[PDB]
Amino acid sequence: RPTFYRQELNKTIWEVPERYQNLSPVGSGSVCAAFDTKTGHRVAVKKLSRPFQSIIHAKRTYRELRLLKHMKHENVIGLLDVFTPARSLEEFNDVYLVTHLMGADLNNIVKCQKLTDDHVQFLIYQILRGLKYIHSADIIHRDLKPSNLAVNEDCELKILDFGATRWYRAPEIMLNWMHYNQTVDIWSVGCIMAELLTGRTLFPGTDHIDQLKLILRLVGTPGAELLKKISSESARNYIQSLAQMPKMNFANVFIGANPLAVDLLEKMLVLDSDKRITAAQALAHAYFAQYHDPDDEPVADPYDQSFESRDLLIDEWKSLTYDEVISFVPPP
Ligand SMILES: CC(C)(C)c1cc(NC(=O)Nc2ccc3ccccc3c2)n(CC(=O)N2CCS(=O)(=O)CC2)n1
Ligand SMILES: CCCCCCCCO[C@@H]1O[C@H](CO)[C@@H](O)[C@H](O)[C@H]1O
């Protein structure tokens, strides 16, 4: 067991192994940049806020640790370390997670640099590659957006979740549909890719209802085949309130873009989630010919999510969380 030290940062206490130096705030968990002396690389340290305050917080904490411990892929956040100051389960109250520091998020990149068609292919490729992995663990991101995409100076990318979001959100989540297939994240990729292509937000909605009106203007009112799958008597009427919008031709909308990019966008921004391209299918799309490698798009180990159906006591979640801190094995 390491020796820890205490530092006060923006009224927050931080007790970290000495391994980690130069803690320096990044925003409010709360997150600090730090320098890892055992590697001479810079890292990001997240202190979980109030990990065990309620049963629900406790199950969230356990959910995060289990997920981050499972994710082992180049385009997805991974765990370099997980620690606690506690010497014992009785003392256990704080969890810290450690991962690679990345320099910038995709928003930053898009704002001060017009990307070439090659850049869009590499960036979107990598998002689909991490997504193929995450989806293969039967996980749904649900909040994919540029601020959740960490990008290095070689334009290499990792998917994570820091925790308007509405701009990249599938229309079924904003109509609280409740089922949700993994292609809600594919919706998000089409929004992001459209924005990499034009330099502009595709659906900059003012609020919830503006968001939907903007979506329907591009992709049109639900066609007969979609209207047929909507079980909810209520929803059906609410939809057939909205103005009878035609689907726009995307070739006309993204005027000077690679015709392969347009075609992929048509296959991502489909109202019907059953008709949306999957991440694995998209990786086979001709727009990615220069990057696609079917022997290097790995899938995840089976992921035991049986905890999700469990309603347990705070201290049981806490004990489970503590077990997982103990059993952690850092990467090579
Ligand atoms: C694999 C994917 C889907 C992409 C992923 C990664 C993360 N979470 C994450 O990225 N944690 C972070 C973020 C910044 C960090 C910065 C420094 C160090 C560690 C850091 C850990 N989530 C969300 C999550 O864990 N829960 C579970 C808990 S919840 O409250 O249910 C919300 C979703 N999903
Ligand atoms: C007016 C706004 C129309 C929103 C249409 C969103 C329909 C998305 O697609 C629907 O996704 C569900 C998964 O959650 C599936 O159960 C349905 O089979 C599928 O058609």
CSV table of C-alpha atoms and ligand atoms in Angstrom, one decimal:
chain,number,residue,atom,x,y,z
A,1,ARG,CA,0.0,0.0,0.0
A,2,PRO,CA,1.3,3.5,-1.1
A,3,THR,CA,1.6,6.6,1.0
A,4,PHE,CA,-1.0,9.3,0.4
A,5,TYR,CA,-0.9,13.1,0.7
A,6,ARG,CA,-3.6,15.7,1.2
A,7,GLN,CA,-4.2,18.8,-0.9
A,8,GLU,CA,-7.1,21.2,-1.0
A,9,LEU,CA,-8.3,22.2,-4.4
A,10,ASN,CA,-11.1,24.6,-4.9
A,11,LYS,CA,-12.5,23.8,-1.4
A,12,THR,CA,-12.3,20.1,-2.3
A,13,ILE,CA,-10.0,17.7,-0.4
A,14,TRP,CA,-7.9,15.4,-2.6
A,15,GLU,CA,-6.0,12.4,-1.0
A,16,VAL,CA,-3.9,10.7,-3.6
A,17,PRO,CA,-0.9,8.4,-3.8
A,18,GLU,CA,2.4,10.2,-4.1
A,19,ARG,CA,2.8,8.6,-7.4
A,20,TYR,CA,0.6,11.5,-8.7
A,21,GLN,CA,1.9,15.1,-8.5
A,22,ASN,CA,1.0,18.6,-9.7
A,23,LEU,CA,-2.8,18.2,-9.2
A,24,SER,CA,-4.5,20.9,-11.2
A,25,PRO,CA,-8.2,21.5,-11.7
A,26,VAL,CA,-10.1,20.8,-14.9
A,27,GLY,CA,-13.7,21.4,-13.6
A,28,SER,CA,-16.6,20.2,-11.4
A,29,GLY,CA,-17.2,14.3,-9.6
A,30,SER,CA,-14.4,16.8,-9.8
A,31,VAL,CA,-11.5,16.1,-12.1
A,32,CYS,CA,-7.8,17.1,-11.8
A,33,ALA,CA,-4.9,16.9,-14.3
A,34,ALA,CA,-1.8,15.4,-12.7
A,35,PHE,CA,1.6,14.1,-13.6
A,36,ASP,CA,2.2,10.3,-13.0
A,37,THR,CA,5.8,9.9,-11.8
A,38,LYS,CA,5.8,6.1,-12.2
A,39,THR,CA,5.4,6.7,-16.0
A,40,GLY,CA,6.3,10.3,-16.6
A,41,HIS,CA,2.9,10.7,-18.4
A,42,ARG,CA,0.2,13.1,-17.5
A,43,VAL,CA,-3.2,11.8,-16.3
A,44,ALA,CA,-6.6,12.8,-15.3
A,45,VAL,CA,-7.9,11.9,-11.8
A,46,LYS,CA,-11.7,11.8,-11.0
A,47,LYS,CA,-12.9,11.9,-7.4
A,48,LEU,CA,-16.3,10.5,-7.2
A,49,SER,CA,-18.7,12.9,-5.5
A,50,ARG,CA,-20.7,11.4,-2.6
A,51,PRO,CA,-20.2,7.8,-3.9
A,52,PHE,CA,-22.5,6.3,-1.2
A,53,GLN,CA,-24.9,8.9,-0.2
A,54,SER,CA,-28.1,7.0,-1.3
A,55,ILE,CA,-28.8,3.4,-2.5
A,56,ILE,CA,-29.0,4.9,-6.0
A,57,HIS,CA,-25.7,6.8,-5.7
A,58,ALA,CA,-24.2,3.6,-4.5
A,59,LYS,CA,-25.4,1.5,-7.4
A,60,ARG,CA,-24.1,4.3,-9.8
A,61,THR,CA,-20.7,4.1,-8.2
A,62,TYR,CA,-20.6,0.4,-8.6
A,63,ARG,CA,-22.0,0.7,-12.1
A,64,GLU,CA,-19.1,3.1,-13.1
A,65,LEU,CA,-16.3,1.1,-11.6
A,66,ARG,CA,-17.5,-2.2,-13.2
A,67,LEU,CA,-17.9,-0.5,-16.6
A,68,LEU,CA,-14.6,1.3,-16.6
A,69,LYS,CA,-12.8,-1.8,-15.4
A,70,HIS,CA,-14.3,-3.7,-18.3
A,71,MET,CA,-13.5,-1.2,-21.1
A,72,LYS,CA,-10.2,-2.2,-22.8
A,73,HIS,CA,-10.1,-0.6,-26.2
A,74,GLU,CA,-8.1,2.1,-28.0
A,75,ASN,CA,-11.1,4.4,-28.8
A,76,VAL,CA,-12.7,4.1,-25.3
A,77,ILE,CA,-11.8,5.5,-22.0
A,78,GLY,CA,-9.8,3.0,-20.0
A,79,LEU,CA,-8.7,2.7,-16.3
A,80,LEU,CA,-5.0,3.2,-15.5
A,81,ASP,CA,-5.8,3.0,-11.8
A,82,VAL,CA,-8.5,3.1,-9.2
A,83,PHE,CA,-7.7,3.9,-5.6
A,84,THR,CA,-9.1,4.9,-2.2
A,85,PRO,CA,-7.4,6.4,0.9
A,86,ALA,CA,-9.3,3.9,3.2
A,87,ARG,CA,-7.3,1.1,4.8
A,88,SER,CA,-10.5,-0.9,5.3
A,89,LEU,CA,-14.2,-1.4,4.3
A,90,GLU,CA,-15.3,0.5,7.5
A,91,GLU,CA,-13.2,3.5,6.5
A,92,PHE,CA,-14.2,3.3,2.8
A,93,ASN,CA,-15.9,6.5,1.6
A,94,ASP,CA,-14.0,7.9,-1.4
A,95,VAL,CA,-13.3,6.4,-4.9
A,96,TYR,CA,-10.7,7.9,-7.3
A,97,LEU,CA,-10.4,6.8,-10.9
A,98,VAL,CA,-7.3,7.4,-13.2
A,99,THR,CA,-7.1,7.5,-16.9
A,100,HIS,CA,-4.9,9.1,-19.7
A,101,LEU,CA,-5.0,12.8,-19.9
A,102,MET,CA,-6.3,13.9,-23.3
A,103,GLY,CA,-5.6,17.4,-24.6
A,104,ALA,CA,-8.9,18.5,-26.0
A,105,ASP,CA,-12.4,17.5,-26.8
A,106,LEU,CA,-13.9,17.3,-30.3
A,107,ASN,CA,-15.8,20.6,-29.8
A,108,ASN,CA,-12.5,22.5,-29.4
A,109,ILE,CA,-11.2,20.8,-32.6
A,110,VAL,CA,-14.3,21.7,-34.7
A,111,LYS,CA,-14.4,25.4,-33.5
A,112,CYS,CA,-10.9,26.5,-34.5
A,113,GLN,CA,-10.1,24.1,-37.5
A,114,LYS,CA,-12.2,23.3,-40.7
A,115,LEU,CA,-11.6,19.5,-41.1
A,116,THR,CA,-10.9,18.0,-44.4
A,117,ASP,CA,-12.9,15.0,-45.8
A,118,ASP,CA,-10.0,12.8,-44.7
A,119,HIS,CA,-10.2,14.1,-41.1
A,120,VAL,CA,-14.0,13.4,-41.0
A,121,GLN,CA,-13.4,9.8,-42.1
A,122,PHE,CA,-10.7,9.1,-39.5
A,123,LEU,CA,-12.5,10.8,-36.6
A,124,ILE,CA,-15.9,9.2,-37.5
A,125,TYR,CA,-14.2,5.9,-38.1
A,126,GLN,CA,-12.7,5.9,-34.7
A,127,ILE,CA,-16.0,6.8,-33.0
A,128,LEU,CA,-17.7,3.8,-34.8
A,129,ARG,CA,-14.8,1.6,-33.9
A,130,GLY,CA,-15.1,2.3,-30.1
A,131,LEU,CA,-18.9,2.1,-30.5
A,132,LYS,CA,-18.7,-1.3,-32.1
A,133,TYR,CA,-16.8,-2.4,-28.9
A,134,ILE,CA,-19.1,-0.7,-26.4
A,135,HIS,CA,-22.2,-2.1,-28.2
A,136,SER,CA,-20.8,-5.6,-28.2
A,137,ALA,CA,-20.8,-5.4,-24.4
A,138,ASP,CA,-24.6,-4.6,-24.6
A,139,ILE,CA,-23.9,-1.1,-23.4
A,140,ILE,CA,-25.6,2.1,-24.7
A,141,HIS,CA,-23.8,5.4,-24.4
A,142,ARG,CA,-27.0,7.5,-24.7
A,143,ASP,CA,-25.2,10.9,-24.5
A,144,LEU,CA,-22.7,10.7,-27.3
A,145,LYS,CA,-21.6,14.3,-28.2
A,146,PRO,CA,-18.4,16.2,-29.1
A,147,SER,CA,-17.7,17.1,-25.4
A,148,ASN,CA,-17.6,13.4,-24.7
A,149,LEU,CA,-14.9,12.7,-27.4
A,150,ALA,CA,-11.3,13.2,-26.3
A,151,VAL,CA,-9.0,13.8,-29.2
A,152,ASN,CA,-5.1,14.0,-29.2
A,153,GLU,CA,-2.8,16.0,-31.4
A,154,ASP,CA,-2.6,13.1,-33.8
A,155,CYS,CA,-6.4,13.4,-34.1
A,156,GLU,CA,-6.7,9.9,-32.2
A,157,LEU,CA,-10.0,9.7,-30.3
A,158,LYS,CA,-11.5,8.1,-27.2
A,159,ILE,CA,-15.2,7.9,-26.2
A,160,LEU,CA,-16.0,8.6,-22.6
A,161,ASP,CA,-18.9,10.2,-20.6
A,162,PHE,CA,-18.1,13.2,-18.3
A,163,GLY,CA,-21.7,12.7,-17.1
A,164,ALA,CA,-26.5,21.2,-25.3
A,165,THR,CA,-26.7,17.4,-24.8
A,166,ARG,CA,-30.1,17.6,-26.5
A,167,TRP,CA,-28.5,18.5,-29.8
A,168,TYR,CA,-27.1,15.0,-30.4
A,169,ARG,CA,-30.0,13.2,-28.9
A,170,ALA,CA,-32.1,10.5,-30.8
A,171,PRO,CA,-35.8,11.7,-31.2
A,172,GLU,CA,-37.0,8.5,-29.4
A,173,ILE,CA,-35.2,9.5,-26.3
A,174,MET,CA,-36.9,12.9,-26.3
A,175,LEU,CA,-40.2,11.2,-26.7
A,176,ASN,CA,-39.3,8.9,-23.8
A,177,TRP,CA,-39.9,5.7,-25.8
A,178,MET,CA,-38.4,3.5,-23.1
A,179,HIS,CA,-37.0,0.6,-25.2
A,180,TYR,CA,-34.1,2.2,-27.1
A,181,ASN,CA,-31.9,0.1,-29.2
A,182,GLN,CA,-28.1,0.8,-29.5
A,183,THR,CA,-28.7,2.8,-32.7
A,184,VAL,CA,-29.7,5.8,-30.6
A,185,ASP,CA,-25.9,6.2,-30.5
A,186,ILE,CA,-25.8,5.9,-34.3
A,187,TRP,CA,-28.2,8.9,-34.4
A,188,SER,CA,-25.7,10.8,-32.4
A,189,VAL,CA,-22.8,9.9,-34.7
A,190,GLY,CA,-24.8,11.3,-37.7
A,191,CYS,CA,-25.3,14.6,-35.8
A,192,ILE,CA,-21.6,14.7,-35.0
A,193,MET,CA,-20.5,13.8,-38.6
A,194,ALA,CA,-22.8,16.4,-40.1
A,195,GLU,CA,-21.2,19.0,-37.9
A,196,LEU,CA,-17.6,17.8,-38.8
A,197,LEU,CA,-18.7,18.2,-42.5
A,198,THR,CA,-20.3,21.7,-42.3
A,199,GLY,CA,-18.6,23.3,-39.3
A,200,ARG,CA,-22.2,23.8,-37.9
A,201,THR,CA,-24.5,22.2,-35.4
A,202,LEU,CA,-27.0,20.2,-37.3
A,203,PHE,CA,-30.0,20.5,-35.0
A,204,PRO,CA,-29.2,23.6,-32.7
A,205,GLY,CA,-32.5,23.3,-30.7
A,206,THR,CA,-33.5,26.0,-28.3
A,207,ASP,CA,-35.4,23.6,-26.1
A,208,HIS,CA,-37.1,20.2,-26.2
A,209,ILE,CA,-39.8,20.9,-28.7
A,210,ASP,CA,-37.6,23.1,-31.0
A,211,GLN,CA,-35.2,20.2,-31.1
A,212,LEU,CA,-37.8,17.8,-32.5
A,213,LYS,CA,-39.2,20.4,-34.9
A,214,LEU,CA,-35.6,20.9,-36.4
A,215,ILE,CA,-35.2,17.0,-36.7
A,216,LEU,CA,-38.5,16.6,-38.5
A,217,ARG,CA,-37.6,19.4,-41.0
A,218,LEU,CA,-34.6,17.4,-42.2
A,219,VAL,CA,-35.8,13.8,-42.1
A,220,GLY,CA,-39.6,14.4,-42.4
A,221,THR,CA,-42.7,13.3,-40.5
A,222,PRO,CA,-43.0,9.6,-39.7
A,223,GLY,CA,-43.9,7.6,-42.9
A,224,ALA,CA,-46.6,4.9,-42.9
A,225,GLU,CA,-44.1,2.1,-42.0
A,226,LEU,CA,-43.0,3.8,-38.8
A,227,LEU,CA,-46.5,4.9,-37.9
A,228,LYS,CA,-47.5,1.3,-38.0
A,229,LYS,CA,-45.0,0.4,-35.1
A,230,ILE,CA,-46.2,3.0,-32.7
A,231,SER,CA,-48.3,1.2,-30.1
A,232,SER,CA,-49.1,4.3,-28.1
A,233,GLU,CA,-52.4,5.7,-29.2
A,234,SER,CA,-51.3,9.0,-27.6
A,235,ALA,CA,-48.0,9.3,-29.4
A,236,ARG,CA,-49.7,8.6,-32.8
A,237,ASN,CA,-52.0,11.6,-32.5
A,238,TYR,CA,-49.3,13.9,-31.1
A,239,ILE,CA,-47.2,13.1,-34.2
A,240,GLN,CA,-50.1,13.6,-36.5
A,241,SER,CA,-50.4,17.1,-34.9
A,242,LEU,CA,-47.0,18.1,-36.3
A,243,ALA,CA,-46.8,19.8,-39.7
A,244,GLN,CA,-46.7,17.3,-42.7
A,245,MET,CA,-42.9,17.7,-43.4
A,246,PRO,CA,-41.3,15.9,-46.4
A,247,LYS,CA,-37.9,14.2,-45.9
A,248,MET,CA,-35.1,16.4,-47.4
A,249,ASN,CA,-32.7,15.1,-49.9
A,250,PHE,CA,-29.4,15.1,-48.0
A,251,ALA,CA,-27.3,15.5,-51.2
A,252,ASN,CA,-29.1,18.8,-51.4
A,253,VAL,CA,-28.4,19.6,-47.7
A,254,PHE,CA,-24.7,18.8,-47.4
A,255,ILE,CA,-24.0,20.2,-50.9
A,256,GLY,CA,-20.2,19.8,-51.4
A,257,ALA,CA,-19.6,16.7,-49.3
A,258,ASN,CA,-18.2,13.4,-50.4
A,259,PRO,CA,-21.1,11.4,-51.9
A,260,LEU,CA,-20.0,8.5,-49.8
A,261,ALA,CA,-20.3,10.7,-46.6
A,262,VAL,CA,-23.9,11.8,-47.7
A,263,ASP,CA,-24.9,8.2,-48.2
A,264,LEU,CA,-23.6,7.2,-44.7
A,265,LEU,CA,-25.5,10.1,-43.2
A,266,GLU,CA,-28.7,9.0,-44.9
A,267,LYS,CA,-28.2,5.6,-43.3
A,268,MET,CA,-27.5,7.1,-39.8
A,269,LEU,CA,-30.2,9.9,-39.5
A,270,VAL,CA,-33.3,7.6,-40.1
A,271,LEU,CA,-36.2,8.3,-37.8
A,272,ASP,CA,-37.0,4.6,-37.5
A,273,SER,CA,-34.3,3.1,-35.2
A,274,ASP,CA,-34.8,-0.3,-36.7
A,275,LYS,CA,-33.6,1.1,-40.1
A,276,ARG,CA,-30.5,2.8,-38.9
A,277,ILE,CA,-27.1,1.3,-39.8
A,278,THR,CA,-25.3,-0.4,-36.9
A,279,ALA,CA,-21.7,0.5,-35.9
A,280,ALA,CA,-20.3,-2.8,-37.3
A,281,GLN,CA,-22.2,-2.3,-40.6
A,282,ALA,CA,-21.0,1.4,-40.8
A,283,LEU,CA,-17.3,0.3,-40.4
A,284,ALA,CA,-17.8,-1.8,-43.6
A,285,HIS,CA,-19.2,1.4,-45.4
A,286,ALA,CA,-17.2,2.5,-48.4
A,287,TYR,CA,-16.6,6.0,-47.0
A,288,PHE,CA,-14.1,4.2,-44.6
A,289,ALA,CA,-12.3,2.1,-47.2
A,290,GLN,CA,-9.0,3.8,-46.3
A,291,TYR,CA,-9.2,2.9,-42.6
A,292,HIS,CA,-11.4,-0.1,-42.2
A,293,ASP,CA,-9.5,-3.2,-41.1
A,294,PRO,CA,-11.8,-6.1,-40.2
A,295,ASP,CA,-9.0,-7.8,-38.2
A,296,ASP,CA,-8.5,-4.8,-36.0
A,297,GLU,CA,-12.1,-3.8,-34.9
A,298,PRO,CA,-12.1,-5.9,-31.6
A,299,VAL,CA,-15.3,-6.7,-29.6
A,300,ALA,CA,-15.6,-6.9,-25.8
A,301,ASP,CA,-15.4,-9.7,-23.4
A,302,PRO,CA,-18.8,-10.7,-22.2
A,303,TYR,CA,-19.9,-8.3,-19.7
A,304,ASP,CA,-21.9,-9.5,-16.6
A,305,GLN,CA,-24.6,-6.8,-16.1
A,306,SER,CA,-26.8,-8.9,-13.7
A,307,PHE,CA,-26.2,-6.3,-11.0
A,308,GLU,CA,-28.5,-4.0,-13.0
A,309,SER,CA,-31.7,-5.9,-12.0
A,310,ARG,CA,-30.7,-6.0,-8.2
A,311,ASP,CA,-32.1,-3.8,-5.4
A,312,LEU,CA,-29.5,-4.0,-2.7
A,313,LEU,CA,-28.7,-2.1,0.6
A,314,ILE,CA,-26.2,0.8,0.5
A,315,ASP,CA,-23.5,-1.1,2.4
A,316,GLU,CA,-23.9,-4.1,0.0
A,317,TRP,CA,-23.2,-1.9,-3.0
A,318,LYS,CA,-20.4,-0.3,-1.0
A,319,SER,CA,-18.9,-3.7,-0.2
A,320,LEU,CA,-19.2,-4.8,-3.8
A,321,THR,CA,-17.5,-1.5,-4.9
A,322,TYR,CA,-14.8,-2.2,-2.4
A,323,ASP,CA,-14.2,-5.7,-3.7
A,324,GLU,CA,-13.7,-4.3,-7.2
A,325,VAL,CA,-11.2,-1.7,-6.0
A,326,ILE,CA,-9.2,-4.6,-4.4
A,327,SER,CA,-9.3,-6.9,-7.4
A,328,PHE,CA,-8.2,-4.2,-9.9
A,329,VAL,CA,-5.1,-5.1,-12.0
A,330,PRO,CA,-3.5,-2.1,-13.8
A,331,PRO,CA,-2.9,-2.4,-17.6
A,332,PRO,CA,0.7,-3.4,-18.9
B,1,LIG,C1,-17.8,3.3,-21.9
B,1,LIG,C2,-18.7,4.5,-21.9
B,1,LIG,C3,-20.2,4.3,-22.3
B,1,LIG,C4,-18.2,5.5,-22.9
B,1,LIG,C5,-18.7,5.2,-20.5
B,1,LIG,C6,-17.7,5.8,-19.8
B,1,LIG,C7,-18.4,6.4,-18.7
B,1,LIG,N1,-17.9,7.1,-17.5
B,1,LIG,C8,-16.8,7.8,-17.6
B,1,LIG,O1,-16.3,8.2,-18.8
B,1,LIG,N2,-16.1,8.2,-16.5
B,1,LIG,C9,-15.1,9.1,-16.4
B,1,LIG,C10,-15.1,10.3,-17.0
B,1,LIG,C11,-14.0,11.2,-16.8
B,1,LIG,C12,-12.9,10.7,-16.1
B,1,LIG,C13,-11.8,11.6,-15.9
B,1,LIG,C14,-10.7,11.1,-15.2
B,1,LIG,C15,-10.7,9.8,-14.6
B,1,LIG,C16,-11.8,9.0,-14.8
B,1,LIG,C17,-12.9,9.4,-15.5
B,1,LIG,C18,-14.0,8.6,-15.7
B,1,LIG,N3,-19.7,6.1,-18.8
B,1,LIG,C19,-20.8,6.6,-17.9
B,1,LIG,C20,-20.8,5.9,-16.6
B,1,LIG,O2,-19.8,5.4,-16.2
B,1,LIG,N4,-22.0,5.7,-15.9
B,1,LIG,C21,-22.2,4.8,-14.8
B,1,LIG,C22,-22.4,5.7,-13.6
B,1,LIG,S1,-23.9,6.5,-13.9
B,1,LIG,O3,-24.1,7.7,-12.7
B,1,LIG,O4,-25.0,5.3,-14.1
B,1,LIG,C23,-23.7,7.4,-15.3
B,1,LIG,C24,-23.2,6.4,-16.4
B,1,LIG,N5,-19.9,5.4,-19.9
B,2,LIG,C1,-42.3,12.3,-34.2
B,2,LIG,C2,-41.0,11.7,-33.7
B,2,LIG,C3,-40.9,10.2,-34.2
B,2,LIG,C4,-39.9,9.5,-33.4
B,2,LIG,C5,-39.7,8.1,-34.0
B,2,LIG,C6,-38.7,7.3,-33.1
B,2,LIG,C7,-38.9,5.9,-33.5
B,2,LIG,C8,-37.6,5.2,-33.3
B,2,LIG,O1,-37.7,3.8,-33.8
B,2,LIG,C9,-38.4,3.0,-33.0
B,2,LIG,O2,-37.5,2.7,-31.9
B,2,LIG,C10,-37.9,1.8,-30.9
B,2,LIG,C11,-36.8,1.5,-30.0
B,2,LIG,O3,-36.7,2.4,-28.9
B,2,LIG,C12,-38.4,0.5,-31.5
B,2,LIG,O4,-39.2,-0.2,-30.5
B,2,LIG,C13,-39.3,0.7,-32.8
B,2,LIG,O5,-39.3,-0.6,-33.3
B,2,LIG,C14,-38.6,1.7,-33.7
B,2,LIG,O6,-39.3,1.9,-34.9
